[PDB]
């Protein structure tokens, strides 16, 4: 059938790159134009791209076998031999990391708990700090299935071990650039988002991470190309791709006011025509509708044109 | 268009009553047959039932205007004036609570954080204990927009009143029965799951909560009727209802070998024909296929035939 979209407002959706609600919808021409996000990526033909999972609960998480060692130059670490989050074997393949693995940089606080398999399993929990970044550490290679972290909080002298699940808690020194996935070697990646026509800019769905700085915590924005419900929608459908892009309208739910027309490119990112210097936010209580298949060179009206 | 389901394995899905992956798929005739779950409830016509939200991130969470008051020999007491989790006004209506509010009982550990509205907002995080009730001394009223939690404190914690979001962390004394929604008074509820034909039992999607005691923590099962991906699927579609149920087959994804046939009743729960007395677990790497619309009286094949 013709491609269509759920008639769900962004403010009711789940974020696709940090596991929290969508709070914001914006364009910002001052930001990197062609981010190389690995989560929140789907093709309109139904193919999840990069490390994108179908479940929001997998976003910025990982599963592993946990053990401990002294690391040369660093000190006491935990090593994590990664597993897919459903417990299935991780095999290095056509994506940078296990499904849902973090696709940004910074020092991530993770909470690591014993795997839950049945009622009565005894659970330990330990908190760690994991450096995602331009690391050159042979122990940090999520593509090959191994990462490491430092212990930062422990309930007891009996730390978590064996099969575990890691969830994100907070970020320090956040940078929205891909981590080092394969210890400075080439790694399979979803390509950068783009290209855009002249005057076209990426539509961003925004949430907030808890960013710590020793004493005081602050909100830090993180964007994604589509909410997780739109990711799972395309993955659950097998739409026929009839052209390069879909023309959409975003309308106020209550009044029907057109807020903007936009293009959903086949590779799963939305473009608006906007040439301001700084951020333009939109109401999150609007609806998307599919108008038509259109060519890549289809010229959009500028936001607020009459 | 004919009803179809996403071709997603249970083990790749999100749980609809506790915000975690689905780990298990089972029937268990020892458990309560007709539970009154309020989350994870959707009609095949696309209507969210009970308190069920679209987003898995809303499950067992709430949002509120918080007021904190210190009480000698308790600590900080939070009065939360609930809002919907999108920041919209909560109005007592045709469901027991704001969307996604917990639908089980026990003492819930919640992590409460300052509302996040823009980069640079200063955030404070505090962990509270919330008795979901019913207890002879519980006066929770989420239906009216008013709930309470407390944190043990020798002195004031200098908490700041304002808008917050609360997420679940652990449970103590879990019981799978509805919480105190309205100060011991009646409240609109999604009806119990059912009814079932003779020999039919509920199919359960299982995850595990962290359940704490004084010095220990252990996994505790919680079941839901559908994964959150099926909830959001039905709510996103507007299928034309043609009969009373959908005949499904649960199949090995590779081989296509049938594990069982089942009925998805229009009111959003799946039945199998199973008369064992013990729990019967299923592999979580199968998929559900819609076969056809069938009436309420359609007799399923017994699991194993």
């Amino acid at each position: 059938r013709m491609v269509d979209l759920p008639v769900i407002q962004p403010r009711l959706c789940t974020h696709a790159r940090w596991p929290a609600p969508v709070y914001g919808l914006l364009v910002d021409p001052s930001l990197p134009s062609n981010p190389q996000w690995q989560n929140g990526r789907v093709h309109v033909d139904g193919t999840l791209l990069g490390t994108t999972p179908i479940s929001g609960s997998w976003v910025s998480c990982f599963a592993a076998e946990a053990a401990y060692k002294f690391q040369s130059g660093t000190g006491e670490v935990a090593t994590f031999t990664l597993i897919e989050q459903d417990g299935s074997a991780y095999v290095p393949g056509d994506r940078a990391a296990p499904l849902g693995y973090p696709d940004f940089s910074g020092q991530l606080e993770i909470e690591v708990q014993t795997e839950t398999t049945k009622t009565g399993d005894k659970l330990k929990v330990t908190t760690f700090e994991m450096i995602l970044g331009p690391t050159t550490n042979a122990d940090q290679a999520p593509y090959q299935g191994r990462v490491f972290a430092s212990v930062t909080a422990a309930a007891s002298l009996d730390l978590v071990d064996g099969r575990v699940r890691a969830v994100p808690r907070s970020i320090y020194g956040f940078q929205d650039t891909i981590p080092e996935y394969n210890d400075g070697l080439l790694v399979p990646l979803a390509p950068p988002i783009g290209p855009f026509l002249p005057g076209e800019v990426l539509l961003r769905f925004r949430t907030y991470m808890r960013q710590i700085d020793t004493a005081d915590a602050a909100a830090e924005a993180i964007d994604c190309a589509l909410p997780q419900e739109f990711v799972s929608w395309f993955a659950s459908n097998a739409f026929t791709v009839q052209s390069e892009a879909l023309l959409l309208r975003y309308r106020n739910t209550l009044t029907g006011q057109l807020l903007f027309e936009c293009k959903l490119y086949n590779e799963g990112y939305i473009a608006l025509s906007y040439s301001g210097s700084g951020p333009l936010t939109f109401p999150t209580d609007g609806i998307f509708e599919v108008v038509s298949w259109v060519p890549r060179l289809y010229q959009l009206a500028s936001v607020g044109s009459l | 268009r004919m009803v179809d389901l996403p071709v997603i394995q249970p083990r790749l899905c999100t749980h609809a009553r506790w915000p975690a992956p689905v780990y298990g798929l089972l029937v268990d005739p020892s458990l309560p047959s007709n539970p009154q779950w309020q989350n994870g409830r959707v009609h095949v016509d696309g209507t969210l039932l009970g308190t069920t939200p679209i987003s898995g991130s809303w499950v067992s969470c709430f949002a509120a205007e918080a007021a904190y008051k210190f009480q000698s020999g308790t600590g900080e007491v939070a009065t939360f004036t609930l809002i919907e989790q999108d920041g919209s006004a909560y109005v007592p209506g045709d469901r027991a609570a704001p969307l996604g509010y917990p639908d089980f009982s026990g003492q819930l550990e919640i992590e409460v954080q300052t509302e996040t509205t823009k980069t640079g907002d200063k955030l404070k995080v505090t962990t509270f204990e919330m008795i979901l009730g019913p207890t002879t001394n519980a006066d929770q009223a989420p239906y009216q927009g008013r709930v309470f939690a407390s944190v043990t404190a020798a002195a004031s914690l200098d908490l700041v009143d304002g808008r917050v979001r609360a997420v679940p962390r652990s449970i103590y004394g879990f019981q799978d029965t509805i919480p105190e929604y309205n100060d011991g008074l009646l409240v609109p509820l999604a009806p119990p799951i059912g009814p079932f034909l003779p020999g039919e039992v509920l199919l359960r999607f299982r995850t595990y909560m962290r359940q704490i005691d004084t010095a220990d923590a252990a996994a505790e099962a919680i079941d839901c009727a559908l994964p959150q991906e099926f909830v959001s699927w039905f709510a996103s579609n507007a299928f034309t209802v043609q009969s009373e149920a959908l005949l499904l087959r649960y199949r090995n994804t590779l081989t296509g070998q049938l594990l069982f046939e089942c009925k998805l009743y229009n009111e959003g729960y799946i039945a199998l024909s199973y008369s064992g007395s013990g729990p019967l677990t299923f592999p979580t790497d199968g998929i559900f296929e819609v076969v056809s619309w069938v009436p309420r009286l359609y007799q399923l094949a017994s699991v194993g035939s």
Epitope: H43, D45, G46, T47, L48, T52, P53, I54, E84, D86, S88, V91, G93, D94, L99, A235, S236, A238, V241, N266, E267 | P6, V7, I8, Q9, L12, T253, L254, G256, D285, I287, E289
Partner: nanobody
């Protein structure tokens, strides 16, 4: 649900070439990406190559510039042209497919490739 049937394979001398193909049948709208893994005795499957519905390809470093994958969407069929075969390419080659959850869900029966010296 989705069956994968391989063709091709067998014995070749080092420096030679073989073509493998794979055809999918059953409920193929649940089959997204198709690819090839290979396995030596006592070892796990290792990724060789994949190709998406949009014909986007990935290759293991060890086979880059020697192996080429192609796909026919209408026939749910892929081909792997393997040139400049090396001893270390000796393995059982297995056609694979992802389902809608982005996991590798479907396996062929496997075909022995032996690169003799």
């Amino acid at each position: 649900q989705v069956q994968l049937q391989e063709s091709g394979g067998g014995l070749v001398q080092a420096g030679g070439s073989l073509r493998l193909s794979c055809a999918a049948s059953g409920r193929t709208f649940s089959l997204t990406t198709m690819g090839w893994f290979r396995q030596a005795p006592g070892e796990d499957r290792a990724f060789v190559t994949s190709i998406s519905r949009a014909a986007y390809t990935y290759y293991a470093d060890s086979v880059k510039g020697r192996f080429t994958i192609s796909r026919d969407n209408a026939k749910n069929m892929v081909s792997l042209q393997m040139n400049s075969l090396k001893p270390e390419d000796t393995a059982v080659y297995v056609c694979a497919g992802k389902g809608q959850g982005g996991t590798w869900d479907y396996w062929g029966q496997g075909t022995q490739v032996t690169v003799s010296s």
